[PDB]
């Protein structure tokens, strides 16, 4: 992907955001903004310019699944890559994220390799 690709990292705790932001930096992506929940995330996405969303599941105001679903139903964001990074690992939830159109799913705690791997596969699709 283009190194100027703009990312939105959504989590209600800074730890995940820092980890993800730093791994993104290691891969060469510095254009990264953060949000603290689904609503906060939607306010920034509506501002436009975003090219990739990575977000937690358990968050107040609007969780990750609901965020994913609104993004997928929005004519201006419907194809936005949405990679879930969350501690949530129960099967019924994994299946739900998949049925709602999640672009990928990484379980917390995750290694640097796992994130780069998942990210790169989504990136390949963005190129075709």
């Amino acid at each position: 992907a283009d190194k100027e690709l703009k990312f939105l990292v959504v989590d209600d705790f800074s730890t995940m955001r820092r980890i993800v932001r730093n791994l993104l930096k290691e891969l060469g992506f510095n254009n990264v903004e953060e949000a603290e929940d689904g609503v906060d995330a939607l306010n920034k996405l509506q501002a436009g310019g975003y090219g990739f969303v990575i977000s937690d599941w358990n968050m107040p105001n609007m969780d990750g699944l609901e965020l994913l679903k609104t993004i997928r139903a929005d004519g201006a964001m419907s194809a936005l890559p949405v990679l879930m990074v969350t501690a949530e690992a129960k099967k019924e939830n994994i299946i739900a994220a998949a049925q709602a159109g999640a672009s990928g799913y990484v379980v917390k705690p995750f290694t640097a390799a796992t994130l780069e791997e998942k990210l790169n596969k989504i990136f390949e699709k963005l190129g075709m």
């Binding site: 690992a89 129960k90 099967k91 019924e92 994994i94 299946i95 994220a97 998949a98 999640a102 990928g104 799913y105 990484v106 379980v107 995750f110 796992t114 998942k118 596969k121």
Partner: peptide
Amino acid sequence: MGDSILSQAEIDALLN
């Protein structure tokens, strides 16, 4: 009864 938890590999099968 216990939960149905999926590993990262099982998750990769349908999401990654």
